[PDB]
Every structure is written in C-alpha cells, then in structure tokens.
C-alpha cells in the first residue's frame, strides 16, 4: 500500500471506469421465471467441460495481470481461490515474461498453487506482426503449463493510448492459423472490452479459430482507462476518447452475434458480468461459460477471504437463476426460456438475426 | 474585442443555439466495432474526390461569412487552415459583395491564402426570384476562383426573422436549371439547419441538381438564432419560434433520405457534425463527405492555433472510427457495417425507406 | 375581480388542469420540412369551408360558457374577436338558457357582435337522455341564429362529479336521429376532453351523424377539474379521479380513429391544441379544422387585446407550418408529408389502422 | 419590434440582469406587524414633499433613457403615467441631447405630457470630468423645465466596459460645487447600481451635496450588463466582470450608511425596489422616497396600461405595509418599528453604526 | 503529452483538488465600494517593494516545481512571463538538485530567462530536521542567484502520505536561526495549504523569522492530493485524509492572525488566491503581497500565451478593485475600508483579535 501499482491496474481498480457511459445490453434479456421449477436447489449441477477438463461452475476468471512481484501476489490469490472453487483462470499478457526471465515467476506461481484447474496463457494479437510466433506461444504455455492460450484484440485501447498505433494486418491471422497446427492446446481469441461482431467472428473462424471470448462493452471500459491516462498527461486525445466511451458491441449483442455466426463455437460471454444473474443470462443467451475480470481483481486486492466470498455470491446467484428457471444443469440453462426486449431486440433485427433461427441455434 | 460583430455571428458564437431543443438523430446510428480490423493505423487513407480535385480528408468547412473587414479576418484564418489540411472551404453568402465592391476583399482573401483547395461560392435561393441569375453566379465564382457554387435554402430562418418573408417560387429552380447550363463549375444546393427531405431532393434533382448538402437539424439552430433576435426586439414572434425549435429533418434522417431518393448524388452530410465520429457516421450512412460550420467559426475566433488543433482532433477521431471499423479508406467506410435503432429507425420505416434496399444503395 | 366565478370556470382558468397527467400524442407526429417550399409566404391561403360559409383560417373556438352576466361578458369578447378574424365560435351548453329566460342574453350577445361568422349552438347528450327534444334544440339554435349545433359527450366528467351518474342509453341516439330530420342546420357530436374512438364514431355514424369534434385527452382535463372539486369538498372520489387522469383517447389518435373509421366525416381536431403548429398537425393528420377552448378562455379573461394577440400568434404559427411544408393552402396541408412515431404509432398498429390505407384516406 | 434597441436597453429589458448574483439586503429588514393599527385603510395619506412640490406617493421613477425616437416613445409613456399618479420622474442621461439637437425632443416630450410633477434632469459625473460646465447643466434643466438635476456615478460599469477608463478626479466635485452656486434647482448625486457608502456620502456632503439616491446593489446589475456586452464581443473582461457581480453596497446598507453619515440628507432609497413592500422598507430604514427604474422600463415596454397596473400594485403594497404597521402617513412610516437581522446587522456593526443612535437618526 | 508527470504535479493539475471541501474565508471579506473614487484608472500605481527590489504588481508566483526536464520546461515558461510582468517567482523545493547535479538546470534556467525580478529559492523544513545546514542553503540560493529563500512547512501533507512520518522538532528552528546568521538573503517561512496560526507565527518570530507566506486552506488542498495518492494505492489512509479535508487555517484568517501577532512582518497572503479581487482582499486584510501557485501551473501547462493572458486578467481585476475602492496605490489599498462578516468574524472574535486594534495594525 506504499508503492504505486502499474498505471492500468491503479486506474481499473480505483477510478470510475466499470461500465462508464457503456452498456452490456443484459438489461434487455429477461429469464422467464418458473413458479414450479421441477427440481430441487440441492440437485442443481453446475459442472461443465472446458476443453479436456471438467470445471465446477460455468464461470472463468479472464486474463488481467502478471509481470512484477505485486502482480504475482494478486495472481497467486486469484489462482488459489480459483483452484478451491474449481474454476478456470486466465493470466494477463505474458509479453513481459517472454522478454524478461525475472517476470516469469509472477505467472508460474499460478500453476504452483492451482495444479488442477484449466489455466489459460495470454499474448496480444499485434505481437504476431512484430516477431512473435510459435516459439513464444509455446513458451507462454509452458511457463504456466497452460491448457489453452488466449490471443487478445485491443485495438480500441491502442488507438486512444498516448503513444500508439494499433497493427492488425491480416498476416497476424495467417501466422496464428499456422501456429494453431503446431500447438498442443487450443487458441481462444478474446476482445478487451469492445466486443466481437459477426464479421470479426466469421473472419477469425475462416482462419481456423473456434473458441471466442466476447469481452463486450458494458464492463471494464479500456477506452475510459486510456482517456484517464491521457487526462493525467494533459494529452488532448482524452477528449477524443470521451467521444468513444460507448464504442463497441455490447456483451449481450456480441454473445448473440458470435453464437449466430459461428453456431458450433465454444463461447465465453464476458465484459460486464457482475453477478451470477449476469452469468446466467450470458449462458442462456448463447455462451458456454461466463467470464469476469475487474470484480475479481477488486476482491483479490481486498484479499483471499474477500475473493472467496465473491465467488460464493456469484455461484449462489447463478444457482438461484437456474433454480428459478427450472434448470437442473448448465445444458438446461442454455435452453431455458427468455425474453429479448428494447435496444438488444432492435440490434438483432437490424443485424439480420432471425430470432427463430437464433432460438434454435442457442438451444 | 471592442466593436460588436454582426448580430447573427454574435449569437451563433456566444449564445446557446448549438443543438438547442433539436437532434441530429446520430445517436441512433452505431458503427459496428471490428476487434480484428485487418489493417494498421498507419495505412488508413483519408483522401477522397471533391469534383475535379483530391482532398486530404472527407470533410469540408461549409459557408458562413464574409462582407465586412472583421469577417474577412475570420475567413482568412479558416482558409489558411483549410489549405494546410487540404480540406475544402465554402464561403458565406456573397450577396453583399455582389452589391458592394468594398465587401469583395473579405471573400477574395480566401483564395489568396488557399490557392489549392476547393473553394465553394455561395448565394441564397431567394435571390434567384429577385433578379440574381447567371451573371451574379459567375461573379461570385470569379471573385474567389471557386470550384463550385452553393445555393442555400433557409426558409425556416426567414419565416421567424423579425422582418420578412421567404420566397421560393418554382421560377427560382427554372432559372437555376438555365444557369447550370452556362456555368463552368457545379452547383450544390444546401439547407441551413433544417434539412433536405426526399421530396425536396427529388424536386431539385428534377431541375438537374445532383449535389446536395443536408444541413439537417441538430447542429446550429437558426430558428433559435432568430428567436433570440426577436427576444432582443421585444418581438412576439419569439414565442412562435420557440414552438418550432425542433422543426426540420434531423441530419442523419436527411442523409438517408437524400441517398435513398437520389442514389447517384454527391452528398455532403452536415448539420451538427461535432466530432470525427459524427463525420464517420455521416459518411457510413450515405454521405460522401461531412460538413461543419459552427465549431470551425468558434475555434477560428479563438485563433489559428485553436482551429489547427480542432482539425487535428476531428481527423484523429475520423481515423479512430475507420481503424475500429476495419475501414482502410473512405470507400471502405461508406460500406462498413452499422446498426440503426430508435427514432431514426421509426423515421425510415414510416418514410418507406426499405432498409434492404437502403443498405445496397449506401453500399 | 370581486365576485367568484362559477366553479368549473374558476378551476379551468386558474388551477393546473391543462394537460395534467395526460397527452395529445401530437409529439409523435412530425410535419416533414421542405427546404424548397415552392411558394412564397404571401401566397398562402388559409381559407376553408365550414358548412355553408367560408372562414378565414381552419380553426374554431369550441364551446365553453354562457348563462350568467359575467359569462356573457367573456362570450362577447370571444365573439367580437372571432368575427374580426373570420373564425367560427361555439358557445357553451345552452341548458341554463332553455331553462331560464334571464340566461338567454349571455348567449344571444354572441350573434349581436358576430353577425357573419358561423356560430355553433350547444346542448349535452345527457339533456337528450333527459327529455330535451326538437323544440329545445330549435330554441338553442334560434337563440343565437346558429349555423350548427354541437351535442357534447362528457361521461368521464360525469362519473367523477361529486354528484354524478351518467346515463347514455341508445334511445338518446334514436332521439337525436329523429331530431336531425327536422333541424335546418347540421349536428356535430363532440367529446369534452376524453376523445372519440372508432367504436363511438361508427355508432354515431350509424345514427346519421357525420360531423365530429375529437376533444381528445391532452388539453383541458375535465377528470382533473372534477378531482379538484372533489378535493375542495373532502370527497374521497378525488383519489379515484386521480387514478383516471390519463383516461381517454389522445387527440392525435382520436383524429386518426375518426378519419379512418368515418372517411367522409367533417372532423374538428381538438383537445390540447395550443399553437398554430399543433393546429397544422391536427389538420395534416386528418382533421378539417383545429378547435381550441381553454387558451381562448384564458386570453379572453385577460381582455380583448390579449385575445387578438393570441389569434395573431396561432395564425402566424399555422402559416409558418404551411410555408415550411410547401402547403399553399389548407387542402395541400391535408396531404402534406408527415412522420408518425412512438406511442401513436403503436396505438394505430394495435387498433388495426393500416397506415398505407390511412395515408390514402387522410390524403 | 423590428429594429434593434440600443444595446444597454436591450440587455436590461430582456436578459437576466435584475439582481444577478447580488442582494439588496432588504430581506434582513422586517417591518413589525401591528395587529391593532389604530387607523382605517381609507385615512392613510401617502403624500410627501419633493423639493418645492408635493407628490402623491413617496416613490419616484429614476433616470433611464432618452436620445433616440424609440427611447422618446418609452419616456412619453412613463411620463404620462407618472403625471397621472403624481409621482416624480427622472430622465436618462442627457449627454446625447447636449451634443445633438435631434436628440432633444425624446427628452422634452416628458415635460409636454407631464406638466405638473417634478422632473429630474440627468448628466453623468464623467461629463464633469470632461468639461461639461454650468451652461450644459442649465441646458439639461431647461430642455425639460426640470425641478432638479441628478448627477450619476457609474465607475463600476465603466471599469468593465469593453472600452473603458473611468476618471473620477476631485476637480469634478470642485466643478460641481461651483455649478451648484449658479443653478436654480437642487442637485442629487445618485449611483447606478453599486451603492453609496458613508465615505462617498461624506465626501459629497463636504462639497455641498445634500440630496443622494443610493442606487445600491441588488437591483439592476450594471456590472452584469457590461459582462454580457463583453461576452457578445468575445472580450475576456467578461470573466473578470463575473468575479465582481456582487460588488457594491447593498441598497439597505447604503440607506443606513447615508442616513447615518448625513442625517440631514434628502435620501432616495433605490436599487432593487420591486414592490411597495420594498418601498416601505426603504423608507422605514431611513429613505425619504423609494426610487425604481428597471421594472418601470419593462412595464412601459409592455404599454401604458401595463405601467398603470404596475403603479397601482406598488401603491397598494405600500399602503398595505403602512396599514399593517399602523402608519397613517409617510412620516409615521419613517418612525415605525423594524427589526434588522442577518448580514445587514453584521454590516452595520462592522461599519460602526451604533444602532441606538441609528434608530434616533432615522426616527 | 506522452510521458507521465511526477505524481504530485499530475494530481494537482488534472484532479479536483482546488478548494476541495475547504474555504479561504475570503467570501466573508467585502471591500467597500466608493462611487466617487477620487482617482483615475490610469493613475493607479501597483508597484511595491519585495526586499531590496521593486516589483510591478503586489503578487508573486509561489514555489511549485523543478528537478526533471519537463519540470524545467514549466519553470522556464513561468519565469519568462514573470520577468515580463515584473513579478517575483519562487521555485519548488530544490532538495533533488542539492542531491543530484543533473536536477540543477531545471532550476537555474529560471535565473537565465528572468535576470531582473526577485527569485526565491526553496527547501523544506523537513530538510533541516534531516541534515541540511548552511552550505546546502547557500547552494540552493546560488543555483538560481536567489534574492531570498523560502522554507516550507508541510506537516499535514506529510501525515497523510502513504509513507509518512513528519518530524518537526525544535532543533530545526535552532538550526534555521543559526543559518539565517550566515545567509546573505532573507528567509521566508511558508505553509503549503494549511495556513499559519498566531502560535506558529509567534514561535517562528521568536527564532528570528520576519517574513511569512500564509498558504492557508481554501486553495490547493494537499491533504486531498495525498488522499488521492492513498486511494491510488488502495491505502486505508485515504478515508482518514478525507476526514481532514477542511483541516487548517483559512487564508483570510491566517492573514489576520499573522498581521495581528507579528505586526511588523512582511506577509505574503496565499492559498486559494484565484482572481485579482482575491489578491486585493488579501492585501486589504493585512498582506503585503498576494501569492498564487496552482492557477499559474495550470496556465503554464497550456503555454506561455495562456499564462500571459492569466496575468493580464489578474492585474486588471486587482486594478478594478483598487479603482472601485479609490485606492491610488498599494499603500492606499492596505488601508481601504472593508467589512468582515460571517465565520471569519466569528474566528477572529474567538481568537481574541480585537477588531479595533486589528484595524489599526493592518492600517
Ligand atoms: C486490470 C486488468 C488488466 C487486463 C484486463 C482487464 C483488467 C481489469 N484484460 C481484459 C479482461 O480480460 C476482460 O476482457 C475485460 O476487462 C472485460 O471483462 P470485465 O468487464 O473486466 O469483467 C486483459 N485482457 C487480456 O487479454 N490480456 C491482459 O493483459 C489484460 N489485462
Ligand atoms: C455564423 C454562421 C453563418 C452562416 C451559417 C452558419 C453559421 C454558424 N450558414 C449555415 C452553415 O453553412 C451550415 O449549413 C449550418 O450552420 C449547419 O452546420 P453546423 O451545425 O453549423 O455545423 C450559412 N450557410 C450558407 O449557405 N450561407 C451563409 O451565409 C451562412 N451563414
Ligand atoms: C371553461 C370550459 C367550459 C366548457 C368546456 C371547456 C372549458 C375550458 N367544454 C369543452 C371544450 O369545448 C373542449 O372540448 C375541451 O375543453 C378540450 O379543448 P381544449 O383542450 O380546452 O382546447 C365544453 N364543451 C361543451 O361542449 N360544452 C360546454 O358547456 C363546455 N364548457
Ligand atoms: C435601462 C436603464 C438605463 C439607465 C439606468 C437604468 C436602466 C435600467 N440608470 C440607473 C437607474 O437610474 C437606477 O439607478 C438603477 O438601475 C437601479 O435601480 P433599479 O434596480 O433599476 O430599480 C441610469 N441612471 C442614470 O442616472 N442615468 C441614466 O442614463 C441611466 N440609464
Ligand atoms: C504542483 C505544486 C507543487 C508545489 C506546491 C504547489 C503546487 C500547486 N507548493 C505549495 C504552493 O507554493 C502554495 O503554497 C500552495 O499550493 C497554496 O497556493 P495555491 O492555492 O496553490 O495558489 C509547494 N510549496 C513549496 O514551498 N515547495 C514546493 O516544492 C511546492 N510544490
């Protein structure tokens, strides 16, 4: 509590950037109550598959950090709790540990304290245009004995950074498609707060990507975070960032767009998942699991007991929503009755998402 | 800073008239975020055609002023900055310069400091019913070696002015049609804050006019400006003007209406364009270029450095929206995916704009 | 200013009952602006027919009062101004003057100071329920040399009266149909603030009534007026009236319902008409004439000059809406382009108003 | 209603400058209610002396305008109503009419329609600073057969003028003392919205001035008026004027300061007098007469009838305050019981106004 | 605009810490307006003495920064503008430059571009408790050829720092008294936002300090700044700092306390001076000169022209206050009439500041 944290963690944890001027559109999704659930709360089974492993609840912690000692302390807390609950955990970008051996332990610690759960490696898509490839993926994976690797897209954050220029030439996907052949674990492509559209999902699927993490708008606003970095430097790009605070595909729309355009994908619904009711909605809408990042960071900073109480609350809320929809298991929740209203309805109509066909696909 | 400005400039620059009680409907248009853009920021090309010239960015400054020394100094600042950025500039109505030789310099200064960019001349449609014709158009054009001439429509402003009566007999378009035959440059017909409908666009097109500048409601509210002139005179028309503050076709609806009804038009989207994101929206919706007047005037009054900063910000915001839609160039932006929601969707439905065919036409 | 007025006039003029918790739905109707109107302001012709007479402007003052000296003074003001402007005027219910000779002059004064315009007699439907018949109708007409007689429906007001029991049995319409055979002037059936539905209009038309005045919700709220009378008496019906403050067909929807269900009707659009723009919207939507009551009462109380200024304002606003839709005359305004949005659109869709056929019917 | 008014009249009448960010402190003065007044309403006598004449009510209209035709029309309205009510009227500064013969009639009209009441000429102190002398003072008096001449102080307004440099050297008071020797009528020195302090009153009294008009803060805010002129010119002095909007001695404190420091003065209490109750408070606090300017201007603009209703209201409110303090005449109101509270009390204590002796002085 | 600033400068310039939950009490001080000033604006003389030099205006820029290249750039701007306006400038703490030769140039540059005005060096009282002695003071003075050195007190900022333990033992004052013997320039002791009380002023004067800078609460809130640094680190001291946001002696009360307790002091009135009227109030209350820091930093960050404009406004506001109190020079302003009200009057009463004697002392 004396030394400063890296600036992006300092801002995410302590500034007003969660859902700032943005929306998941989850308020436009209603799960229909069943006054006769047909199940017992104690029979509800929240187990599900995550590649070759079984996990205890259809939630994951998505990648955030690593690379300095204090960041390894936060990673260790999150991993210990994730191991206890049987939930998968992604790490943050491993680029610093690829570059510097001293940064490695703040990632490897995760696997030491969480030997059984799925652990998910992380590198950013622009690194593929800047020299990273098969070897650096394998290094990231072996560092934490990962069961998958996430490749993140963050062009909106990069456009509004004080220095910088997003680079997403098609060569990156050509290289990723090559790497996907040689890796021993699956690739998931995720956004970083601005969501995945049907066009992007279909382009990724054409290069062999089958696993996606929506990371839609409505949760951590990385455009807001770069706006605050720009404010702190007296950088005029801050006022430009302000005009883009509601840029991106809202999480509920991105889950519908990826499930509809890639019906057989393995889909993580994330970006603004803050309760187990949000998690249930994301699954019923079409995700296979719900992901969360910021609220886990905030609770882990408060400490291990805070984070265990956080997962207790999320799991309770998910099971309440399953009980009150008569969903005895995760498969039943994916098929349960919903109502779609409001702006989400209008988004799907304009985008050509024929709801009857949608309903069949999501199940 | 001692002498009063002309009354309409004083009010537009310093009273609350920008979007007063009115709306562009641009908030109902969303550009769909592409988390894999397929391009590098440094590859984005914003060049586009403006008649026989290329311009650097698909934006123009539309006509505002001229005719007095202090107005000449604002024109000179705006023209030097436009020249430096490679953007077209319209001047304000040249009627006073046609009438008085001493008023000419405050228009001509534009072409002196901006020898390369397109410069657009300006006369009012009602002058055509009051003796102006071919010679006065040629004179307006020669005064600034213009590349085009804008003919403005402002009946709403004229209805509420303390004095006066709009005159828009069809003879004006008969005369404009004859003129267009003899002129060496194209004619653009523009509104002045209340927008172009399908009926107006089709009537103009039927007299040979193919170049339109929407100047929709949502930006400078000229009904509110005359309301303020009437308030200042103790004139009761002020309360009637109040009842019409939201009169007009909103800029986004007018861009759709003109593009749908006149698919081969060259279309400036203006009226309440206040960021490069608004500009990108207007182009994606169907415009060829985005036009701005009031914010350029306010920054030019602050000075040359303020207006250079203003254009740097608009350009950066337009490039951010192109980067985040995967639009490598202006042609790509015109075909990028959008969502239309809300009142703009209801407007297009009632007006018979078949969205399937809309999407095809805008591209 | 020393003696109290009759209670319903005192409440209407001075309590907050105009539009209380109620809506005309006119905000959902947009008149499409035409930047090239095709006319000059001075050629606009506002003349129209009202039965066998021509009137100067398509607006009428609907019935409000009469029956005491002070009410006769307000009637004289309204009538002299109406005569000067060439606009028709209805009087308030003539029941008291049928009952008492001393109450006659406060009605007859209207024809004395207004010899040329149309003057519309008034009796309530509940008087036909109670045995008024042909002679009392003839006497109401003769008293003011009326050009028509309006029969008002006010069941909502009657239900919430401290004393009240409305009776609206079908034999009253049998009596009215018999009476219509023997009168020299046409009958108009109007509501009193809660609007005419398609069922009510079709029922009235089946008994021979062809002239209707909507008197929809959104203007004077007569449920609110009786709520206030109940409050002043410590009567618990006030809380019940509160629950009905938004009861009734909104003016814009009643115009649509009557014009669609009775396409040949002569239709006054009234209830909450408060500007010339509201008047123009009522006519473009399907009315022949716009009617107003409360704002005329409030201005007449202020005095003759205040009421002349009031009409000047309404007329100017109507002509501005005509000018800015390119409507050279009232017939053109009836066919001008509009947009219907919002709740009005949903109301019409649910009620089976096929908008295509609506547009044809209204013109 | 078509030509613009002179700028300071346009701003005063129609912008929000009455009491802007300023206070009369009259809310800190309570007149003690007397439940047994000892008089009947009809015996109240409001007559008082104004120099050699008797006036009907202890109120005057203070100087505002003149010098153009339209300003002459407002002066004629005020003067005819003042003559009808028996109240004195001052004219606005006569500088323009001293400079230009064509501007004379807009002042002289006052004496033509008001032959009997006191009429007070007006010139500014800055004219004495600039070499106006005895003949220009005599000419200002003769122009309207004035009964007195007011010399106004307006340094605060002059400091914030776009153009301004106030000069208030002691030789002007030497000139004024010389002039006073040779005039046939008395001089009143008044402020212009920022109030007379004890230092200023004692300095003026040392040069022979015995008649003062407080013109304190809380009413028309002339710093605010010049702030608005600076805003309209894009002049940065506007922000400085903003910081001074509450500069000056509040009217109630200026009445106390002048009556205490100059106990034999003839004292007009003005600045923010807006009701007959404010007028009665000013007199009970120590003024001889209450003066008003802005509300008279606003009512005269409305018309003769509006200004007659205005005076009827002020007079009735004054007589109600006289009745309810048991004050049968103006002398009694001057001695009636009051309470001083709040900031006014603290102001007086800090300024060394021994309230015991204050009560004796005021009476 | 790309690299981060040092954290205290980032927070002060761009977070909401000016006057946060604190008050100068300057709103309780009124300068009495003089409607006959007795002077001309052009004759007002703002020159005054600052030790052995004459300065152009009685305002100084107090110490803020230096020690890194970007901090040297801001110092260069402030010193160039200060030299232009003839106003003294203090630098920020020189500790880093005593420690590291590379940090010297970012202070020295001040004397290079400002060869004439008074420059004031700066070290903290905590360096005397640690270890600094005569040579390090001499070195700070020679580094910039200073005309005086300020020694700052900042115990409240130190208490709330994430790492802090303030130490203010009396041997530091013994050391300062010994150093003062051997310096060739005077020492000023200043606070840093929490004000100087009569106890602290008397204690300092007993060790030979004769020059003081109040730096009261109401301006830059350094407990707020440390509160935000604590929030950024997740440090629970932030909630404790919250409870102390309004800790300290308000600037106006600190000026009265130090002038009353040390009547012969040379006194800078600072902490929340934001306009020339604030500056005038501080001088009239008892200060010799008014000091500012934060608004100078914010303008310097915008650029040299912004800073020049900021000083033009301050000087104009000061001269307006001088003009409107009839104060021909600074000595006159120091004796001009005031009113003290409200909490400031209560504070002085409770603290035994006999206002009679106060008046005499301040003059
Ligand atoms: C502090 C912190 C840091 C990072 C992130 C987030 C946070 C809060 N996120 C993005 C994260 O995985 C997730 O996609 C978004 O934050 C949206 O989910 P939430 O709204 O936060 O639940 C992230 N994403 C990733 O792929 N690589 C990483 O290095 C990081 N770093
Ligand atoms: C002060 C000023 C003056 C003018 C205008 C505007 C302003 C702000 N505009 C209309 C302008 O070109 C534009 O169509 C509208 O103002 C809408 O765009 P903005 O919302 O202002 O960006 C205008 N247009 C025109 O064709 N001739 C002209 O003389 C003027 N004068
Ligand atoms: C004071 C007053 C008195 C009456 C009325 C109204 C008012 C305000 N109205 C109803 C009126 O004609 C009209 O239908 C409604 O008031 C709705 O129009 P406005 O919203 O008032 O313009 C009414 N109508 C009627 O047919 N006979 C009448 O006696 C009266 N009395
Ligand atoms: C429109 C207008 C114009 C003038 C003024 C006022 C107004 C409103 N006032 C000042 C006026 O006499 C009076 O002292 C102040 O306005 C304060 O009183 P009110 O608050 O306005 O009642 C003013 N006074 C003066 O002595 N000579 C003048 O020429 C004018 N001009
Ligand atoms: C960014 C910045 C940094 C510094 C300061 C201020 C600011 C704004 N201040 C305190 C400054 O001199 C002054 O006493 C207080 O800020 C109060 O005055 P203002 O309210 O800021 O005008 C300060 N004082 C000091 O003696 N040595 C220093 O190093 C600094 N550093």
Curated annotation (Swiss-Prot), chains A, B, C, D, E:
Changing residue 157 to N: 150-fold decrease in the catalytic efficiency and 2-fold decrease in the affinity binding for IPP. Changing residue 154 to A: Does not affect the proper folding of the enzyme, but it shows significant loss of isomerase activity. FMN binds at residues 62-65, 93, 122, 190, 215, 220, 272-274, 293-294. One of its GO terms (molecular function) is FMN binding. Its EC number is 5.3.3.2. One of its GO terms (biological process) is isoprenoid biosynthetic process. Changing residue 157 to L: 28-fold decrease in the catalytic efficiency and 5-fold decrease in the affinity binding for IPP. Keywords: Cytoplasm, Flavoprotein, FMN, Isomerase, Isoprene biosynthesis, Magnesium, Metal-binding, NADP. Substrate binds at residues 4-5, 93-95, 157. The keyword Transcription regulation does not apply. Its cofactor is FMN; NADPH; Mg(2+). Involved in the biosynthesis of isoprenoids. Catalyzes the 1,3-allylic rearrangement of the homoallylic substrate isopentenyl (IPP) to its allylic isomer, dimethylallyl diphosphate (DMAPP). PANTHER family: ISOPENTENYL-DIPHOSPHATE DELTA-ISOMERASE. Belongs to the IPP isomerase type 2 family. This is Isopentenyl-diphosphate delta-isomerase. The gene is fni.
């Amino acid at each position: 509590i004396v030394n400063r944290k890296v600036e992006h963690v300092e801002i995410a944890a302590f500034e007003n950037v969660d859902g700032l001027s943005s929306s998941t559109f989850l308020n436009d999704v209603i799960l229909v109550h069943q006054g006769f659930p047909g199940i017992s709360f104690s029979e509800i089974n929240t187990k599900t598959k995550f590649f070759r492993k079984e996990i205890s609840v259809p939630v994951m912690v998505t990648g955030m950090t690593g690379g300095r000692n204090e960041l390894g302390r936060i990673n260790k807390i999150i991993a210990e709790v994730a191991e206890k609950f049987g939930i998968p955990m992604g790490v943050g970008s491993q680029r610093v540990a690829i570059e510097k051996a001293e940064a490695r332990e703040s990632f490897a610690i995760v696997r030491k304290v969480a030997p059984t759960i799925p652990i998910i490696a992380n590198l950013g898509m622009p690194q593929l245009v800047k020299g990273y490839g098969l070897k650096e993926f394998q290094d990231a994976i072996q560092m934490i004995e990962a069961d998958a690797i996430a490749v993140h897209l963050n062009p909106a954050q990069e456009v509004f950074q004080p220095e910088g220029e997003p680079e997403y030439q098609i060569y990156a996907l050509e290289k990723l498609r090559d790497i996907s052949k040689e890796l021993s674990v699956p690739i998931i492509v995720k956004e970083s707060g601005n969501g995945i559209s049907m066009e992007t999902a279909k382009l990724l699927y054409s290069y062999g990507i089958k696993n996606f993490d929506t990371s839609g708008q409505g949760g951590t606003n990385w455009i807001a975070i770069e706006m605050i970095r720009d404010i702190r430097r007296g950088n005029w790009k801050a006022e430009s960032a302000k005009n883009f605070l509601d840029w991106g595909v809202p999480t509920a729309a991105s889950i519908m767009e990826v499930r509809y355009s890639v019906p057989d994908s393995f889909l993580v619904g994330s970006g603004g998942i803050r309760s187990g009711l949000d998690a249930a909605k994301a699954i019923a809408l079409g995700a296979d699991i719900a992901g969360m990042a910021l609220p886990v960071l905030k609770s882990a900073i408060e400490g291990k007991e805070s984070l265990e109480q956080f997962f207790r609350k999320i799991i309770f809320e998910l099971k309440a929503a399953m009980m009150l929809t008569g969903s005895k298991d995760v498969d039943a929740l994916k098929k349960t009755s919903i109502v779609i209203l409001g702006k989400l309805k209008e988004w799907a109509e304009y985008r050509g998402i024929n709801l009857s066909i949608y309903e069949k696909v999501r199940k």
